[PDB]
């Protein structure tokens, strides 16, 4: 019987191997063991985004955020999800929030978040046209 962290790492390894439904199931089993861990939900939310399941991804972001209001990835995955759903204004504010939080937490993702922000703003602008 695997542990919650064992299942999370198995999920992680499947994700890296691009096996998104398999990984999402592993995170589910992690959650069964310990439902109070934000990273299990943010990890699965990223699976759902890769699986085109935005509503599920949205729901997992909300579960994570209720556990950890400071989660940079929960805000970033939420904004990415909203971006693909064409909720442009919400998407940008959540990407901006992820940026502020990471800066506050001295987390280094290089130019990733500003890069995603430009992409999101470019898309909203092009969409307006």
């Amino acid at each position: 019987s695997p542990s919650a962290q064992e299942l999370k790492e198995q999920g992680n390894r499947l994700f890296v191997g691009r096996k998104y439904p398999e990984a999402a199931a592993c995170y589910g089993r992690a959650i069964t063991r310990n439902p109070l861990v934000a990273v299990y939900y943010t990890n699965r939310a990223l699976c759902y985004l890769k699986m085109q399941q935005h509503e599920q991804a949205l729901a997992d972001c909300r579960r994570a955020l209720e556990l950890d209001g400071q989660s940079v990835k929960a805000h970033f995955f939420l904004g990415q999800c909203q971006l693909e759903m064409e909720s442009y204004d919400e998407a940008i504010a959540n990407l901006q929030r992820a940026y502020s939080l990471a800066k506050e937490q001295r987390l280094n993702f290089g130019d990733d978040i500003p890069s995603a922000l430009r992409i999101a703003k470019k898309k909203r602008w092009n969409s307006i046209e």
């Binding site: 992680n12 990890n43 280094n108 990733d112």
Partner: peptide, 7 residues
């Protein structure tokens, strides 16, 4: 150091 990655 990559944002779109699992933890």
């Amino acid at each position: 150091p990559t944002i779109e990655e699992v933890d």
